[PDB]
Amino acid sequence: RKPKTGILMLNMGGPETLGDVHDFLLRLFLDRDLMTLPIQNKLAPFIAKRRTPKIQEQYRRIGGGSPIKIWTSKQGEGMVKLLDELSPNTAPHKYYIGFRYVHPLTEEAIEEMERDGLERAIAFTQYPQYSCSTTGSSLNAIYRYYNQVGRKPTMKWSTIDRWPTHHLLIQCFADHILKELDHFPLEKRSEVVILFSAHSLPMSVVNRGDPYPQEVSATVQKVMERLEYCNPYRLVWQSKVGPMPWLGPQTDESIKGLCERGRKNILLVPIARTSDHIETLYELDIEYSQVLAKECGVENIRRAESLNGNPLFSKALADLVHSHIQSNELCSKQLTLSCPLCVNPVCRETKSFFTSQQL
Amino acid sequence: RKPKTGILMLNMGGPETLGDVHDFLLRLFLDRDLMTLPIQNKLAPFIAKRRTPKIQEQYRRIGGGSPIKIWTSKQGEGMVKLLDELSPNTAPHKYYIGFRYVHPLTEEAIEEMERDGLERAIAFTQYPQYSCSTTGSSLNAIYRYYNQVGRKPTMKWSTIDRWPTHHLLIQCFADHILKELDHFPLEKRSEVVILFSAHSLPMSVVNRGDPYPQEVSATVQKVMERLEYCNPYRLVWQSKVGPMPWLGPQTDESIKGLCERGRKNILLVPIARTSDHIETLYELDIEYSQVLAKECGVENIRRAESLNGNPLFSKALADLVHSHIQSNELCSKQLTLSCPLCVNPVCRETKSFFTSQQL
Ligand SMILES: C[C@H](CCC(=O)O)[C@H]1CC[C@H]2[C@@H]3[C@H](O)C[C@@H]4C[C@H](O)CC[C@]4(C)[C@H]3C[C@H](O)[C@]12C
Ligand SMILES: C[C@H](CCC(=O)O)[C@H]1CC[C@H]2[C@@H]3[C@H](O)C[C@@H]4C[C@H](O)CC[C@]4(C)[C@H]3C[C@H](O)[C@]12C
Ligand SMILES: C[C@H](CCC(=O)O)[C@H]1CC[C@H]2[C@@H]3[C@H](O)C[C@@H]4C[C@H](O)CC[C@]4(C)[C@H]3C[C@H](O)[C@]12C
Ligand SMILES: C[C@H](CCC(=O)O)[C@H]1CC[C@H]2[C@@H]3[C@H](O)C[C@@H]4C[C@H](O)CC[C@]4(C)[C@H]3C[C@H](O)[C@]12C
Numbered sequence A, B: 001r002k003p004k005t006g007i008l009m010l011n012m013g014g015p016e017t018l019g020d021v022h023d024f025l026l027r028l029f030l031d032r033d034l035m036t037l038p039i040q041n042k043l044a045p046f047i048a049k050r051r052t053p054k055i056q057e058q059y060r061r062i063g064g065g066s067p068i069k070i071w072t073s074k075q076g077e078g079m080v081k082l083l084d085e086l087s088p089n090t091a092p093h094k095y096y097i098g099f100r101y102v103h104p105l106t107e108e109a110i111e112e113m114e115r116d117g118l119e120r121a122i123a124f125t126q127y128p129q130y131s132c133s134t135t136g137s138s139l140n141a142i143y144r145y146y147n148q149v150g151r152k153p154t155m156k157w158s159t160i161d162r163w164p165t166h167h168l169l170i171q172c173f174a175d176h177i178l179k180e181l182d183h184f185p186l187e188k189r190s191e192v193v194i195l196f197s198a199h200s201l202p203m204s205v206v207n208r209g210d211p212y213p214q215e216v217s218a219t220v221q222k223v224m225e226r227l228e229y230c231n232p233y234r235l236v237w238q239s240k241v242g243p244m245p246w247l248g249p250q251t252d253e254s255i256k257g258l259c260e261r262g263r264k265n266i267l268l269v270p271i272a273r274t275s276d277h278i279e280t281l282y283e284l285d286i287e288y289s290q291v292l293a294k295e296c297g298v299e300n301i302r303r304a305e306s307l308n309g310n311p312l313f314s315k316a317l318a319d320l321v322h323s324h325i326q327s328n329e330l331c332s333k334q335l336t337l338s339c340p341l342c343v344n345p346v347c348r349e350t351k352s353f354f355t356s357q358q359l
């Protein structure tokens, strides 16, 4: 039978080959939500051209491009197989990838979903903890697509806009941490300090109200509860760029500081993403675990495996979607409150897009 | 066998009368691990004299003094009654109050516990979420006391150094929120937005690794889970002073921003305090809920009652102490990890004090 229920998996994406780097950067610098540059239509291509060599070099250091699409595909296949059994009344299910800055783009995916004549479309963010710069930006693209195509949707929409504490996500993280603790020397296991690391935000974004640091903090505590507080931890933040203030502590400074303080056995845990990413394979694994850690005289630094193709994580995706369908909800209660100092007029329009849907 | 088990309830304290304000400020400004001032022994008394009138005026606005001691005493009495029945082998139990910056001082309470000839002494912080500037300052005073008096303790020490997700604490907050949502006009209940508000930290402290923002985030999520996400929330931060950057968003800016954006029905929840305090009775209730809120045309702003004399909260305190005794733990696993960028040599000494205790 023709597909009945579309699951739109949303992610920023990354360039699949070196050749895709420039236009990934160009689409990003053009995104008026993410940044207000003067004369932005002229500055965006110039900044993309300037930054491209450096970013292509990073992807070169990890094998030539981003693995996000492979992993997103494998997890979406697994999720659809389960949902056809779990939810016969909404089957067949089909997953679609909507990347914000590379192909397939969010707008290309919506065009195909409509072409396919689905009865309902679920905007399923692949970021478990909500930031306006991540999930909000992917949801804004859905609202803006219909606003700009000048037609109403032909499908019933709803969103799973966050899931920072789903019990099977927490189980996957706990399982990968225990697997990685087993690979330290046994005599150092109990000395291991865990740094959960997540992409940082600028403080201008924290201070306007972004939900993300409190949600990532929640994910951390539920993982440590499941692990029975077996090792001590901190939550720290990676990927800061530029001269402005961002939320710290920084993951690089924290690795170096712990080493300087005699804690030389460290487990990194990428707590805000669901697959490997340049953040993990370059920044944590090369910049921090090889170079920085070597300079400071670490004894053992390891990183928990990304969730990637763990079948339990496909089972989480499916249970999220199945609960969402049975609840009839259109979005979380949290999406109905925009940031207290939000200055972007589209956030309200996108919230209303979802809360106002027929059903 | 006389009192056998002393429970030292630690809090920073506040001045009980207007006459106690100057010496509260003086002790604060002499505390070199909270602040390093040029020519500190001369400047501290001067800044204490200069800022006393303004701080006396805040306390005069709430009736002439801090209620922390009355509430802590009532909670401590309730806790002891329960502990004598829960734990006959460690009875009789006696509570002592140790305030960091007013009488009875931490040092005074230790002197009495040792005078009393207790077998066992439990350093029980009354902050559920740990900051190095709150619970860590109290624990450093216990270590420094023995280091100064140059005698070893005569009782067996251990600490309950944090408890941000204790199930009965969570139940108390959820109960107080729901009863406050009952006081709104029924036609706005669904519209109410919850701002959990906790004392902020300077970014310099957050960026060195202080555990506090992630633990307060955890308390917020456990409370919202218990409430089944009935209303939307943000966690925001109050009490910033001075011109340096602190963690935001600010509670005051957030209340003004929500009003300006049409969310004019707000419930404030002091999520990091267990009793009323100048930050609730003056800052939230007068500066924000009366002056700020009237000025931007709020419709309804309420604040959940502080835990104060709720008997389920004395139940929580006793359950924490009974579980701690049964577990034989000397401190949390998290106290065994100092901040990654800690620069105070005493933190390691105080950690060792607790982890090394006989028993
Ligand atoms: C002023 C502005 C800040 C935008 C903001 O307020 O966030 C910043 C952001 C990106 C900056 C530009 C980009 O970093 C690229 C250029 C970098 C050069 O070193 C200065 C000019 C240059 C063209 C920058 C000018 C200016 O400082 C920009 C435009
Ligand atoms: C790729 C580009 C340059 C950074 C680098 O050298 O890696 C970086 C700089 C700042 C980044 C943006 C900032 O990190 C702010 C955003 C934070 C979100 O968690 C990711 C998207 C987000 C919108 C970022 C995407 C992208 O990777 C950016 C634009
Ligand atoms: C790193 C890059 C400049 C590269 C260059 O031309 O040298 C610039 C271009 C635009 C910048 C972004 C924009 O200024 C908007 C954001 C401004 C916030 O103040 C910090 C992050 C923030 C997301 C910026 C981070 C970073 O400095 C960016 C991504
Ligand atoms: C007294 C002074 C002025 C604040 C005011 O207007 O109330 C403030 C500035 C920073 C404050 C301190 C910092 O907030 C750090 C601590 C926070 C704890 O909640 C109380 C003690 C604590 C050590 C504070 C005591 C006092 O309220 C201080 C020292």
Ligand SMILES: C[C@H](CCC(=O)O)[C@H]1CC[C@H]2[C@@H]3[C@H](O)C[C@@H]4C[C@H](O)CC[C@]4(C)[C@H]3C[C@H](O)[C@]12C
Binding pocket: B035, B036, B037, B038, B043, B047
């Ligand atoms: C420079 C120093 C900051 C030390 C720190 O970073 O902790 C600050 C903190 C408190 C300040 C002092 C207090 O604010 C009291 C005085 C206030 C007057 O405006 C200037 C002199 C005055 C005597 C200050 C001098 C100086 O600016 C001090 C001493």
Ligand SMILES: C[C@H](CCC(=O)O)[C@H]1CC[C@H]2[C@@H]3[C@H](O)C[C@@H]4C[C@H](O)CC[C@]4(C)[C@H]3C[C@H](O)[C@]12C
Binding pocket: B034, B035, B036, B047, B050, B051, B202, B204, B241, B242, B243, B244
């Ligand atoms: C506000 C107060 C007095 C100002 C005055 O002279 O009237 C000053 C004097 C000493 C200051 C403190 C010290 O500078 C040390 C802390 C350093 C952080 O950068 C801010 C908070 C911090 C705790 C300061 C907050 C506040 O501005 C204090 C408490």
Ligand code: FES
Binding pocket: A132, A136, A208, A209, A210, A337, A338, A339, A342, A343, A344, A347
């Ligand atoms: S920036 Fe967060 S809702 Fe608009």
Ligand code: FES
Binding pocket: B132, B136, B209, B210, B337, B338, B339, B342, B343, B344, B347
């Ligand atoms: S400042 Fe946090 S452990 Fe020393």
Ligand SMILES: [Cl-]
Binding pocket: A013, A014, A015, A065, A066, A067, A068, A276, A277, A278, A279
């Ligand atoms: Cl990537």
Ligand SMILES: [Cl-]
Binding pocket: B013, B014, B015, B065, B066, B067, B068, B276, B277, B278, B279
């Ligand atoms: Cl007080």
